[PDB]
Design a protein around this ligand. Structure first.
Ligand SMILES: C[C@]12CC[C@@H]3c4ccc(O)cc4CC[C@H]3[C@@H]1CC[C@@H]2O
Ligand SMILES: C[C@]12CC[C@@H]3c4ccc(O)cc4CC[C@H]3[C@@H]1CC[C@@H]2O
Lengths: 11, 230, 230, 11
């Protein structure tokens, strides 16, 4: 995973 | 979903206006700082695009990984459309062609952006046109790199909805059926040059940081590493 | 000059069908040999394009110097449109994706060409469409690199005549006004990916010959040297 | 000049 995966699964 | 609503949705999805806060390291820090900050909001921009969230997480990262520099530069060009010989990265960060000398090979990249800016004026580019282009850039990427799209057709569906939105916009801008069909051509032909600057920007941003001169940003570096250059 | 005559003129200007006569050096020799031979006839092809000869000699070299690899690859892709997993450089020179391993980094470039070939099928690309694209490629180049165009508008005039020819062709191919205006979009969006392969091909062809492994051709090397890479 | 300049000025 990445920070991209985090920012995309945010709200 | 009718196209005229698509044009309003593209405007609503627009990221906020950002602000900032020179030698080689200073120039690079300032531009890479602005890139990382815009990269964060570009993630939010993509999510608001219709059908983007319905894609798999594997496809969402794929389009953003492939087009993030293109998306950045069309944004920088569009902010500098009405300021000549100057690149408007942020409202309080105004650079001209001259001070690119501080960075090796930078002054070369500035001129292609500035020429693309001066082009946008001559075509009298409209904001609706820019919104579809920047959106089209995101989805026209991920057509090869590598890696495959799980739902390649769903992305084409979103691409065709933005295509129809740009078509609709031109159909009611005061253009006859002769220049109507050609304005679409003149705007899409610009995408090749933007992609060209993308490959030049990626390669320049890779020589740096491999020269250990780009600050540690965890998002920017993840996006560069997503291309796996050598 | 009416567009339907432009479509016939583009067909008449087509270069002849060429023939040829594996390890790393052999693969590179064979492909660079075919490139140099096609480069010679590509000069003749450009001269036949309407308005090309009326340009200055400075502008004629400029468009060919900037787009020669793009023009080559769309030709190679178009010859391989109806042969899967295979690149048809010449009629008696048929290569598949597998034997690109002989050259370092070659197998990467083959896949983007093959994907662009498989794309051309799905779009059911027609010969008239290809002729305008390959022509449009030549003139859409020379929009930045660098070097300026003496008569930048004359080139846009020739670009708009080919734009109208491609538009005319689509207007009588069995497409409604909804898909008529979008087929133009789907074909021009391919130009970004082709330009991308151009930058990858140029950079690959530069690492070679700087590794002293590309045969001495005086036209091919003049065309590579025209980009002045490092 | 180049070979390009020659091939363009040919016939
Ligand atoms: C990516 C670079 C730093 C960040 C720059 C930037 C930063 C922010 C932005 O909105 C656009 C651009 C385009 C040019 C980019 C530069 C081109 C080369 C350099 O590596
Ligand atoms: C330019 C290369 C050799 C010549 C090849 C060629 C040769 C002839 C042709 O019609 C098309 C192409 C496209 C791919 C080219 C190759 C890509 C990398 C290599 O350097």
């Amino acid at each position: 995973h990445k920070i991209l995966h985090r920012l995309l699964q945010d709200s | 979903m009718p196209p005229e609503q698509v044009l309003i949705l593209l405007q609503g999805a627009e990221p906020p206006i950002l602000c900032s806060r020179y030698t080689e390291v200073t120039m690079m820090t300032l531009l890479t700082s602005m890139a990382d900050k815009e990269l964060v909001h570009m993630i939010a921009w993509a999510k608001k695009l219709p059908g983007f969230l319905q894609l798999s997480l594997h496809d969402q990262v794929l389009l953003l990984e492939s087009s993030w520099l293109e998306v950045l530069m069309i944004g920088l060009i569009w902010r500098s459309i009405h300021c000549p010989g100057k690149l408007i990265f942020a409202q309080d960060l105004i650079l001209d062609r001259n001070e690119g000398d501080c960075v090796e090979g930078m002054t070369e990249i500035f001129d292609m952006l500035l020429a693309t800016a001066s082009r946008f004026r001559l075509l009298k580019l409209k904001p609706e046109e820019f919104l579809c282009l920047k959106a089209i850039i995101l989805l026209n990427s991920g057509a090869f790199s590598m890696e495959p799209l799980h739902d390649s057709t769903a992305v084409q569906n979103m691409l065709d909805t933005i295509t129809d939105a740009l078509i609709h916009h031109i159909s009611q801008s005061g253009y006859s059926a002769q220049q109507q069909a050609r304005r679409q051509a003149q705007l899409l032909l610009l995408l090749s040059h933007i992609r060209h600057m993308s490959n030049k920007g990626m390669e320049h941003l890779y020589s740096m940081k491999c020269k250990n001169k780009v600050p540690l940003y965890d998002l920017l570096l993840e996006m560069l590493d997503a291309h796996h250059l050598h």
